[PDB]
Design a protein around this ligand. Structure first.
Ligand SMILES: O=C(N[C@H](CO)[C@H](O)c1ccc([N+](=O)[O-])cc1)C(Cl)Cl
Lengths: 309, 307
């Protein structure tokens, strides 16, 4: 029986990886190379946390990075997955990566998912969770005065909405919003949807129709102000943003767009499209070494806006 | 910029894989660590030393589940709770049993027999502290991959010889059982193009034994133990393109010959370490499932009427 084709593709992929050319095979070197290969990014502590809110319990996970401060700043993170899928486990690597590179604690929220809980519910979970974290800051062991929200894809959509909710509802003061290739609108005619939406690049335009439909259900996009945050008339007074888009992401244009509108309304923004990258690439750092550059970039903005002043 | 070549290689890797509640069931389980209900970082205080441990309790385990005590691989020199986290989650999930992953002390800092005595002592702790762990101390099993399967095999032998915890199973995943590098699979598979090399194994063995000759290390080269009878029923899963294939098979044959019930097979087309590769190689799941299924059978819950 010949080599399993997938094992072959794995071996090829391991072979095209950045050499760690330690000059000699001693136990410390071999250990570092195997840990780099086979373990998720190291953090000091990971705590499975139950968040009891009015009406509902949400699972969450606290990541505390090695060499963080006594009481580090916190970013409350919202996984992506089109408001329909995604778990704490699918984004465990991404949260660890961000925590490691920012030196910030990261609290990842398992908000309730559509269609079971259609739009207003998931964003209310995410907002109520940021509130919970603020009010239980000392109990988590973090500084609730240095708060951020972040998220990828649908999660970036939720983080933008929470930032809006926190400004409108006069909630937790946020030092940053980290938006990683975020969903911002349901206009599927955009250039990048034609260019990138065929399914060739993981995420497809039809996927996004499917997601949006499950999230909104019977609500009209126009009657869903925290869904298409791109359509929010006024984006002034929002937390400083980082908006990283990907070149071959169907969401690229609308994400780029939102960043422009934030910059228009006065919000400080670092905004970049990652060359050669697809949707979901923050989560692909194990196979795509170049993902780390952009992870480091976003975390570097967080580390700056969350500094103990 | 052109599409990133690592990204493009990843994309064709996904494309190379065949095929709301059902949709989540699939996509949540690709490129992600398998979900379990509870994961607890545990410290084990033994005589002379404290070991790190991690307890995995899967979804839909019994009120007081069976326990497999698991020993990671890494040639007795490398590996952590973190490097084998994914593997432990997969086995807990597919078996329905709790899994206790043990961070035994590593060679060359701690040479044979130290890592083995850690692994045995951790089993005895787990049985003694079953109420503390919330598991059923009468439904115990050991397991491990590579040098971890070696340690599991050695522990099953020690538990037998020392009137130690009764074991219902030993799951041995492409185990190291001997340092005979003359064997066929080393010549065929031990070149280095298949992850593990004969040279790698020499290195590991050198670090593990130190000055001690193999002939004086029966709990290391378990293939040189005379009487394997009365040992825990075994699963021994080897890999076609693994240098360790042949000594794994040999150990299985000797288990069987001694009257130990053994499920033994060679995963066709697979390399050393493929149980840990299930995110990239979904066909690994077939073998994970078989191994975990044998665990589940031998760690069977007792009868309870439901009326
Ligand atoms: O023993 C070794 N690796 C073993 C292979 O069994 C280890 O079990 C392992 C390999 C790969 C892996 N992964 O890619 O997640 C995890 C563990 C050495 Cl050759 Cl580095």
């Amino acid at each position: 029986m010949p080599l399993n084709p997938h094992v072959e593709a794995l071996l090829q992929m391991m072979a095209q990886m950045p050499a760690p050319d330690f000059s000699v095979a001693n136990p410390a070197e071999i250990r570092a190379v195997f840990d780099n290969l086979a373990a998720p990014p190291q953090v000091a502590r990971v705590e499975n946390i139950a968040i009891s809110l009015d009406g509902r319990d949400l699972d969450a996970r606290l990541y505390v990075p090695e060499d963080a401060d006594e009481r580090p700043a916190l970013m409350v993170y919202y996984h992506g997955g089109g408001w329909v899928i995604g778990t704490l486990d699918t984004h465990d690597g991404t949260c660890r990566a961000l925590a490691q590179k920012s030196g910030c604690a990261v609290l990842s929220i398992a908000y309730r998912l559509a269609p079971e809980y259609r739009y207003p519910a998931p964003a209310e979970d995410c907002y109520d969770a940021l509130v919970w974290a603020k009010q239980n800051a000392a109990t988590l062991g973090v500084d609730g005065d240095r708060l951020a929200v972040g998220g990828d894809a649908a999660g970036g959509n939720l983080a933008a909405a929470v930032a809006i909710m926190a400004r409108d509802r006069n909630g937790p003061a946020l030092r940053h919003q980290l938006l990683i290739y975020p969903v911002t609108d349901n206009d599927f005619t955009l250039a990048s949807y034609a260019e990138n939406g065929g399914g060739e690049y993981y995420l497809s335009t039809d996927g996004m129709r499917w997601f949006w439909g499950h999230y909104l259900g019977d609500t009209a996009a126009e009657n869903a102000p925290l869904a298409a945050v791109l359509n929010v008339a006024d984006l002034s007074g929002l937390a400083p943003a980082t908006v990283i888009t990907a070149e071959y992401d169907p969401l690229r244009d609308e994400g780029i767009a939102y960043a422009k509108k934030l910059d228009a309304a006065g919000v400080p923004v670092d905004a970049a499209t990652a060359p050669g990258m697809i949707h979901g690439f923050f989560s692909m750092f194990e196979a795509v070494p170049d993902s780390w550059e952009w992870i480091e970039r976003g975390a570097s903005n967080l580390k700056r806006d969350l500094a103990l002043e």
